[PDB]
Amino acid sequence: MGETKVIYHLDEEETPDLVKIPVPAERITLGDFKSVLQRPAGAKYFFKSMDQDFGVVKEEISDDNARLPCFNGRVVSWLVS
Amino acid sequence: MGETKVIYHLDEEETPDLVKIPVPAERITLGDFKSVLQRPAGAKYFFKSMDQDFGVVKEEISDDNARLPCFNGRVVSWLVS
Amino acid sequence: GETKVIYHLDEEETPDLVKIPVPAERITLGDFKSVLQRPAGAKYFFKSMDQDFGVVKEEISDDNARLPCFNGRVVSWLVSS
16 A cells, blocks of 8 residues: 655656556556556656666666666656657 | 666767667677667767776777677667767 | 777766777877867877876877877877867
C-alpha cells in the first residue's frame, strides 16, 4: 500500500506531466507505468538512473517486470514514440 | 551471447542515454551500435578509449567492423551531427 | 607513416586522439592545424622537455616548427578566445 510520483516527458516536450501511481515505490515496474499511460507500442522509455561506473544516465528499460529507478518516491522518465 | 551497456551523448547534451545491446562486450562493433540507433547524414562517433602511453582519450571510429572499447561491460560514446 | 596527436580543448578533462598521416619525424604545427582547420587565433601548447628544466607545456605558434613526439605521440593543449 503506497504511491509513486512519475514525472515523464513526451518526446521533445520542455515540461513533464506528474502522475501518481498507486503502487509503492519499492515495487513499481515498467508494466505498472505502462498500464496507466496505455501508449501505442512501441514507445521507448528512458529513466533517470545511476550507472555504477559512470554516474547519472537516462537508462532505457523495455522489460515490463523491471523495477523503475526511484528517489524519494519519484521516477523521472522520457518517452520516445 | 551476452550484453553490452552503451552510454552515449548526443552533441552537447549533459546526460547520456544508457542502452543495452544484446551482443557481448568481447565482440560488439560500431555496426552493432549503429543498427540500434540508425545514423544521421553521417554522424561521427567517438569512444572512451585507452592509449597505451597516455591513458584515457576519445577515439573517433568510423569503420562498422571495428570493435568498440569496453571496460567492465560498458562503452561510453559521444556523437556529433 | 602516422603520428597520434592527443589534444585537449580549453578546460576539457579528456582529450581527443587523432591520427595524422605524417610520420612523427616530420610532423609540424602546420600539419596539425590543417587537420583541425584551425579553430583560429587559438594558442597551442605541447608536452615537451626543456634541456635545463624538465617537462613543460611549450607554446608553439610557428607552423614550420616540428612538434615534440615520444613514441609516435604528441600531447597538446589548446586555448581559444
